[PDB]
Design a protein around this ligand. Sequence first.
Ligand SMILES: COc1cscc1-c1cn([C@H]2CCC(=O)NC2=O)nn1
Ligand SMILES: [Zn+2]
Lengths: 134, 343, 783
Amino acid sequence: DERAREILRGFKLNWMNLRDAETGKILWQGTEDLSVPHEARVPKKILKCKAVSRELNFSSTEQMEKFRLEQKVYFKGQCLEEWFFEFGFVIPNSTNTWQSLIEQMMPASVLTGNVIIETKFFLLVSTSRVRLFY
Amino acid sequence: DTSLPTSHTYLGADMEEFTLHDDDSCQVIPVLPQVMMILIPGQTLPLQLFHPQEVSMVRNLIQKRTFAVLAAQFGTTAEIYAYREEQDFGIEIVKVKAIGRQRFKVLELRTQIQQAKVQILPECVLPSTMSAVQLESLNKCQIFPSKPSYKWWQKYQKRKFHCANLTSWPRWLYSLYDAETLMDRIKKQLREWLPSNPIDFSYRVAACLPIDDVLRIQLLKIGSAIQRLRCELDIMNKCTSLCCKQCQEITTKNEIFSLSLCGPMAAYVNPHGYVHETLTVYKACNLNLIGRPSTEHSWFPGYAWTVAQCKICASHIGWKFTATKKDMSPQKFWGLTRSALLP
Amino acid sequence: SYNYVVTAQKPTAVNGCVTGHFTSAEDLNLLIAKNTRLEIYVVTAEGLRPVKEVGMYGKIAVMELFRPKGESKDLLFILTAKYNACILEYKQSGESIDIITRAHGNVQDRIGRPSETGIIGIIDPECRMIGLRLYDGLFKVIPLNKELKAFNIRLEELHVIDVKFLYGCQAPTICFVYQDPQGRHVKTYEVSLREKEFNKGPWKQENVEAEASMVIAVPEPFGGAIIIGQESITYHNGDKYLAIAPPIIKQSTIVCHNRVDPNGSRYLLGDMEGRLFMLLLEKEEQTVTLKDLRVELLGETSIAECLTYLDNGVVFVGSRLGDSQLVKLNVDSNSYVVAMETFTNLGPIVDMCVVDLERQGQGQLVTCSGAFKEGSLRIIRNLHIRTVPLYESPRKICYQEVSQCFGVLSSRIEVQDTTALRPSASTQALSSSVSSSTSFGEEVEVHNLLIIDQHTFEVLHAHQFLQNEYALSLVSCKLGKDPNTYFIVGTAMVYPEEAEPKQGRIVVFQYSDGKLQTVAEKEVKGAVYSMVEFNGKLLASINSTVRLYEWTTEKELRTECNHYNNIMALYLKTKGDFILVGDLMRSVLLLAYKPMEGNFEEIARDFNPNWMSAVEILDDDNFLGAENAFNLFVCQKTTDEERQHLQEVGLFHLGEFVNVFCHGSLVMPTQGSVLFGTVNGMIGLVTSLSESWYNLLLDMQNRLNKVIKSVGKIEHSFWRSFHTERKTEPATGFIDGDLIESFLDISRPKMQEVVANLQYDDMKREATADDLIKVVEELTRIH
Ligand SMILES: COc1cscc1-c1cn([C@H]2CCC(=O)NC2=O)nn1
Ligand SMILES: [Zn+2]
């Protein structure tokens, strides 16, 4: 899709910040473009928190009629959990924050490096996979 | 300022602002799942309910309003004093500002979001302790001019309880069991570190006290104002300092101060749902700080928050609040969670 | 559980007094409201004459005589603390005397808390109506209506102090002293019956003394109203405003008054310290107008809750704190008051003890009556009463068998300079000893342990206590292996600043060889509110710490165990291994000291919030108490929660505020005998009854209520139904001993009506008058 290619060229994750929702401590922060089709040094403290507040600030060069996202968690190729978000209208060449949630989980030792977060930014704009190193 | 945090401007200025129940009349009342804190009648509880079941529950309640909060032995019925609903992010967030109105004991726990069957505990108000042995002649002497310290209360004893020579007990005993003397004593010990009604004040200062969950449900179990006030005075005399629950001395009692009309502590809502019974205080030690000062969703307008965890076991137990402007009175303070503090 | 409450001594404290023409237009009588009793005394030159002592099912919260137009003699408005209002006429037919109830009703409001300034009730001088300030923010009004239909009128001033109906007005006019946050003001309302509402009074609000706390309406030709406070006394009548501030009155607050002269020129006042003044009104003729107010100290009398000038210079000083006395106002001073007669007044009974003084097997009771200068020891036998004035407030008494003497915990009010106001029993002791271990005019309470001989009652000793060492409780008892028995006192140092006492002392005295010398003293960190001899080991109540104490061989008290109840144990009674602990909130907690463990263990608990005054252990099962509003009750000790919970088995409205319970009987069917004392000077008695006897006597109560027409037509079940600010439930497990005992007095045909179709078990058979009279005689013999 031409629109998908234009969005991928124009879109860029400025900075992401994953933090405990019960406290707000910045468990992990980064500036890599997670939307591009990597590895994330997220600590194991995510396993020890009830939920995570997730703040993906993204700059988009093209407007999205309904900007939304799908998230999946895979443990050694086996789907562990799935998430879905929705921000909505986005103007071209605009930078916008994305405040949302990430809610039995396996021990960090088992999931250390064996966790894949598949993030699909949507029409489908891009897909990517991030290897989590607890 | 002193009146900034009470309205919860962080929950949004616009809100649908708007329920006495029969005494001892059992009611089937909704119970929300997100409330783990022990509420008191009169303590304000704000709320952020974004779960679909919770949102439907709030819509059903306000389509009528009163809901309930558990601790699950006893609990409190609170009426909703402010409503807001937002459809942002595709989630029908519902932001509420209720206040505890009445009390109850738990009889049953139904499930649908609970609809627990609960019996309302009546406000067991007692009359004046001297209303019994009051002499018909001396009844005219039991009203006093407006209070203009020690001499005034000596006159209060020597006049109000002059009929305590009829009974088999001293004046100061009835002063211990007097409502107004307990009012004065708790006020003195609070200003060392409010409504005129003994019941409302008793619930207010029950909210004020930084006490255990067990002690707070104990106070809820109390029916009469005088028993409660006596228990709170005993607790305040007993309480000395606050330590982290995981450590088992972040903060001392005397350092406590009140930045809100609700008291030194109040229930405040995390920006994404959770509730903390945060206690304001002017001094807190052994707290490592994480995060730059941010005004995003600050509970106290004109202040910037910053996470505070005890450096011993790194457990979050509060936040540091720094004024955005130097003119703010005070310049900075701390807010500590009751859930993580062990008196 | 089944109990039987009877009145061994009728109440003697004079709640109220009013003089008027009740027997006849030519007979001046002094009606005396001795709480639940109403004595119609016809006044004579020789003195008072008993004419009729009616038993009211109710405390007379208000009394007043009034003659409506066309009424030969005054009618009597009686309102009860239970808000039973009744207007009564006194009908005499030969030797048969009866008080007809002209019109009765209940004036209780469904809502509204009672006014803190008491149950005020005032009759219009023209007798068009009755006004009543029962509840703050309302004014009940009864026009003159056989049912006493009362309608409320809203008054905006929720702190009315004293309200009286003015005289010489075109329409009725209340004048009331109320309190706003500004201070005291004096507003008048012209109460229109046709409109049934308040109208603007003859004169508007006039600011008065901040402690202006009594209103007295004046008769014509003066009109207006005198108003009395701490220091100043005012008089208001339209524009006329006469004020004085005598130095005499600043000493004591005036609390009672009584008109002397019908024209209103001469008034009588009394205060808390027993002083009695004569408020003279100067008479000026212009029409008539007041000239000036004068107050003359007539003299010291009993501490009066009411005054009534009868005739010929004779005054009745009706006192709840002391002997109500007929004093004569001499024209020439001696003091102008001279006591003609001294009526016995046992109230307030602060503590007592049943002791066999004569050792004849019948217990002679010894009560601590009176307060301040009217304090006394009253010795009661079968009902002969002997008064022993102490001239200071006695609080607690205990008896020693070996020393043949009582230990009385007396307390006298001294003024810092300290100086005693009067020569008290402590200062008149043969051998006094001061214990060893503010501004001028402030009234401190100096506390002594008097030792009084049982025979002569001369104070054999007086052990004054330390500065501010309030003596709370006292027990005489042997302890441990010590053969000597000790006067053991619990004390608390009560400083003005500290509300809760942080310090105290359990002091062990021994009155041996005519001298009370301290044997030991334990400085406990708290207040020792109560104290008992638990099985040879001393049990004390140090705030919320019920602590046992072994009397060591070194003659020193060693703490054994503690039990922290979260309530300070003000009431501490014991029977065997069973320990009744209680607080003033009706926090009845039953412990059981286990000797095998040597530790206290709670076995039952009932923290029902209600004001409490005294308790007792009727037996191992039952525990008598005394609830908020003049109440008696008995609690009783399948499931741990059910087992560890005292069921409020039996209930009763005594009508008297019980102060004290004591095991014993006044005499040489009903098991047990627990006398009790009252602020109103009653010695009542509780005896546990059998189930069959209780059923028979409750059926008796129902039938007699059907037959006996009490004055005011007050239903008995309402009278004895429980009463609180929030609750009102019928009595259970108690039987009105007065009602059952009234069977012997009612007529024989009425007796036949009562005992008709009643099953009586001696096999159950139809009852008869003689058998059941014998039953009630057996009941009367218990006291
Ligand atoms: C869900 O967590 C977050 C994500 S971004 C900010 C937070 C947050 C905010 N707060 C408190 C801190 C004290 C204050 O003044 N305001 C708050 O609301 N706690 N966590
Ligand atoms: Zn810690």
